[PDB]
Amino acid sequence: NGNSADAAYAQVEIQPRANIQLDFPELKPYKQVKQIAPAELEGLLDLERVIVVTGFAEVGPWGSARTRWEMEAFGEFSLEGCVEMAWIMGFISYHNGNLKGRPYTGWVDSKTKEPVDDKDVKAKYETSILEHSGIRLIEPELFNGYNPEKKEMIQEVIVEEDLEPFEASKETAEQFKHQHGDKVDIFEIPETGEYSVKLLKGATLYIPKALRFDRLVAGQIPTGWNAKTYGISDDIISQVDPITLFVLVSVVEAFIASGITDPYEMYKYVHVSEVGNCSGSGMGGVSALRGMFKDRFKDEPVQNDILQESFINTMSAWVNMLLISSSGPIKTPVGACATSVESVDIGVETILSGKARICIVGGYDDFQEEGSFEFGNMKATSNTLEEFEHGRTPAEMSRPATTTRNGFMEAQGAGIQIIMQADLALKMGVPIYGIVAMAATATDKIGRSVPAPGKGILTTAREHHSSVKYASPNLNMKYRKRQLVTREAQIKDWVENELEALKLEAEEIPSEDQNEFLLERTREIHNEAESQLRAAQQQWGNDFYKRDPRIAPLRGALATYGLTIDDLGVASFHGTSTKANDKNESATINEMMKHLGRSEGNPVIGVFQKFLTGHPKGAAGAWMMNGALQILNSGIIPGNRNADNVDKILEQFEYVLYPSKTLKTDGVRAVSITSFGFGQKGGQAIVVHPDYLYGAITEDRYNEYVAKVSAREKSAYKFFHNGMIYNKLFVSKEHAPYTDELEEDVYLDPLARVSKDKKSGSLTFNSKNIQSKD
Amino acid sequence: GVATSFSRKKARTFDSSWNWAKQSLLSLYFEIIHGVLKNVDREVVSEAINIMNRSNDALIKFMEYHISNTDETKGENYQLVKTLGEQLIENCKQVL
Amino acid sequence: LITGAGKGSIGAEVLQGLLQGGAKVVVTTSRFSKQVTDYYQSIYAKYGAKGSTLIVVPFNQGSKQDVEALIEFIYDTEKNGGLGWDLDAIIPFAAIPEQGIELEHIDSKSEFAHRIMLTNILRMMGCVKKQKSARGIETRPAQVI
Amino acid sequence: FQKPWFATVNGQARDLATMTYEEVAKRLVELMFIRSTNSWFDVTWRTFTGDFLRRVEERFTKSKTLSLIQSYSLLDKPDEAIEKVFNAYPAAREQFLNAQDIDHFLSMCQNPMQKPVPFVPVLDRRFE
Amino acid sequence: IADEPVKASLLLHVLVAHKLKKSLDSIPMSKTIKDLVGGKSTVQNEILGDLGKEFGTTPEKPEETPLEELAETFQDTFSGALGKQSSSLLSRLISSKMPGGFTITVARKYLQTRWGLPSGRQDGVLLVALSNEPAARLGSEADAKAFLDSMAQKYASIVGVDL
């Protein structure tokens, strides 16, 4: 029956192609989100005073947030993971065109230029991907040939017998004379015009030797990561410190994850002078320091302006020169290992003070030879030789809340969130990943140990308990809702009485100038009626517990949204893998939960993300903030897989659990993030499931938002895939959104907003829309 | 073949059952809810054994709380977990 | 103490029982590594009953220098760096597969096997005895299976 | 003109990048499937719309599966083929063309062993 | 072969190439100093500062004029003179790269023996060698001979002479 009965009997297979999703939050129908929040929350909260996390990204030893989350929560990459990690690590490159005649579109290998199917990526690369990702042996290539097994340092010797004469230029011989004095002899060679130098007995000299240093492993950004891959040009790469690349790439990635592909689109809604850069570091460009300090000393070729690239706040500068071109607040904090948490807190306040309505917050810190050495002398980093004697492979050398923990695995990179006013987030229809319920920092006590972890942050649970006979009605939200209704009635009366008064004044005004006067005063009465409503809403909705010592700031933050103290499902511990910190953290949490009156047997689940990523110092709290947000949106709590045996000392802490494998919950309502930097830097930050927010808005508003996000998620997803294939996710602005002439006009006008220029197509400031009556 | 493999520093300890019990109960609870385990699974009895064997006060308080706060009106799977819990609480208190 | 209890052997299922029974075990592995400890970690989380302790050590039963060391490490005091234990049962199930080796092919591999499965088992009992006698222990005999 | 702008949805201008996979597959049928004769005007235009559906399957499947359109004979009832494919992958109703799938589309638009497609998919140097 | 004093249109072209950390060919000769380095005005005033030490006198706004007609304005007062800056950079190049046993002296007389190139040719060969710094301590004398050989062929290409 021929091969025709068997070719029609054969079935065509379909092979799956990577479809890397941005993973925006899943928006429920209004009916469902209205059930989870209490019904009395509607129009209770001022949404200007609510801070939401509206987009997050990181550049870490596991690539982006999406791959790092994949590896943290599932311990392996799916197709979409393997492609993204292969593309990040420059194993694969996209190629549209002709290849050996026939026209090919899709991935190719970066080296061979062989076409690679998506199915075949996991077979071909997922070995090499996992072999050059995360915590592994320090790879010299990545750190200017630094090999911690053979660490160069120079030693002075006093020469005991004169050297062979060596030729040098006149200026060089001169500088040898000025250094060594009589201990050197310089003699011009007539014909050539060059000198002959001869160091004499008693002259200094410096001989290079090697030291075999013992911290051989580190949390390194994957081998083959390259800023060009995102679309940063060589001029930027050459000028700036590598840290500045991380930040820049993290910031464009965060913006994309916020749906905002063009940063100027912010200026359709806000004044240039409200887009804040409240994001800091630990030691800034240490590569540029190591230049000016040690490469200059050896007189190596080093860019003349290497100083400017080493300052903590230079990274915030470059982002704002290349991407944002704002005149918003720029508060760069320094908080050693808790910077990321300080930068949230500053941001939060920077929006609640009103000086800004959007901060770029988060941390970022490089790993370099100088650092890795000084931390090893301090004995804070885990001695890799000792670990090898204990049979620890590199992966498993960061193992928080473990018996056998000795010290932290250092790592590098950046994390960036974008926080906003909820009101403005809904108005722009950006995705909301979380609510920043509180952020706080504290100092511990007098003491003569800088790196000492301490229990200052405990003061987030501070409250009074001497008069708890009867329930405080100030927590009973219904009471609060009543009082807000009582106020908005007075507001009503006030607006009527002011509209009367206006009419009365305007009657005596001449008829020609009447219109102008009424417009100007009707705006100001609308302004004051808003101001009074938001002040009420702020008094009852948000700031009900600021002036009440019987409510803790930690209880206060949850109680804003109707949540009890029991709801705080997850605490994301600092969890460095060092003997003092992990015990001090646990005790502190445990004592906060115990004081506030967490129900017995309702522990917080501990997340120790640093077991995978290691400790990026400045950026630690910005990764835990990303690890929170993705938990809050997945309801999945990743296990500390390196928690082989939880430390018997931590059993005494009743309100703490130490999972060793991923728990796929039915929901997480809130997540604590605690960090303890060097120098008594203690920070805490509470993030709440964004769904609670939607309780506070009407059905119509919600649905209008949902539409605008759905559109802005599609447009993001388009921009993300177009940027990724052709390496143009990064596109530095060439010009500000205003010509040099209008700068003054744009800054002075509070209500200047960018409009699409039809000719160019891009967003710019229009001279019509500056000091405009409309 | 006669290479020295043994070293005392390579000795690994696992002793912290006290924690693992609470994790191993919480994995059950959410597996029952997400209906990965039914009411006809010998795994539900296996788990129940392995929890009981690690009964203490803290574990009984950790169950009592999680099971008592289950919302039986959210689904069928919630009624299943709430019954099983209540029974497994009574077990652990007996074999403590 | 139980040897030859790597994943998917009879030892593995015994170990699951002993830990389920609240026993204090030393399981020895001849392929020690990250994957192996993580496996034993999972086994103890799931099964490891209250009072139960699991100690995973690398071990090459085919060496006498490892066999005398192991027992010296188990029996020696917690001050010296030993476990401070006293064995109630030994289950030396360590073995290596030999297949299609008739009389005439007995070589290195066969000799080594015999040394794991017989001679070094005897040296293990032998070594325990020596430790028990030395510490003056005569009413706590180590069941060998 | 006789070759209309392809990236049109109900009569508003778009681009291949701002159309869903659904929108594109409907617009293809509309421009390449003649209702009156109940046939594809050119078998190469059917093959075109069959490759595009096989590309949608590939993009929105999770694991290796059989092809829903085993033979391009099934396309002879295009509305049933589309409904069937987009029922199986309903995420491809709401998700704009993956940049790679745009390039693949425009790459099929220059296949030299097919009839030149009755539209202009893109404004570039090969517009003329 | 006969000597020829080097041209300002090579000295100003190698200087800009070196400072901008760029290849000699990647510089378009008819393009303003302010256009090459437009963003970072700091490296612009470092170009000016070097050109000042190189050829002394500088015209009014040399930054709005392309390098092309700025090379001929500078050519007026210059006559085969390396200057202190270029001499300092050549001294810098040799000390850091060329290995022990290969100083300027023997490099000059290697250019004289191998190629026949005298002073005015030699100092042009050492300029294109600085334009493409090897950025790696020359391993051996032999490797460095191939290095000078190759950057004497680039000197022969740019001038238009046979060897």
Curated annotation (Swiss-Prot), chain D:
The organism's place on the tree of life at top rank: Eukaryota
Subunit structure: [Alpha(6)beta(6)] hexamers of two multifunctional subunits (alpha and beta).
Family: Belongs to the fungal fatty acid synthetase subunit beta family.
Its biological purpose: Fatty acid synthetase catalyzes the formation of long-chain fatty acids from acetyl-CoA, malonyl-CoA and NADPH. The beta subunit contains domains for: [acyl-carrier-protein] acetyltransferase and malonyltransferase, S-acyl fatty acid synthase thioesterase, enoyl-[acyl-carrier-protein] reductase, and 3-hydroxypalmitoyl-[acyl-carrier-protein] dehydratase.
Signal peptide: none
Full protein: residues contained: 899 to 1026 of 2051
Record protein name field: Fatty acid synthase subunit beta
Note: Present with 91800 molecules/cell in log phase SD medium.
Organism: Saccharomyces cerevisiae (strain ATCC 204508 / S288c) (Baker's yeast)
From Swiss-Prot, chain E:
Modified residues (O-(pantetheine 4'-phosphoryl)serine): S41
Transmembrane segments: none
Ranges for domain Carrier: 6-81
Top-rank lineage group of the source organism: Eukaryota
Post-translational modification comment from the UniProt entry: 4'-phosphopantetheine is transferred from CoA to a specific serine of the Acyl carrier domain by the C-terminal PPT domain. This modification is essential for activity because fatty acids are bound in thioester linkage to the sulfhydryl of the prosthetic group.
Family statement drawn from the similarity comment of this UniProt entry: Belongs to the thiolase-like superfamily. Fungal fatty acid synthetase subunit alpha family.
Record function comment: Fatty acid synthetase catalyzes the formation of long-chain fatty acids from acetyl-CoA, malonyl-CoA and NADPH. The alpha subunit contains domains for: acyl carrier protein, 3-oxoacyl-[acyl-carrier-protein] reductase, and 3-oxoacyl-[acyl-carrier-protein] synthase. This subunit coordinates the binding of the six beta subunits to the enzyme complex.
Assembly information from the UniProt record: [Alpha(6)beta(6)] hexamers of two multifunctional subunits (alpha and beta).
Additional information: Present with 17000 molecules/cell in log phase SD medium.
Protein name: Fatty acid synthase subunit alpha
Organism: Saccharomyces cerevisiae (strain ATCC 204508 / S288c)
Gene behind the chain: FAS2
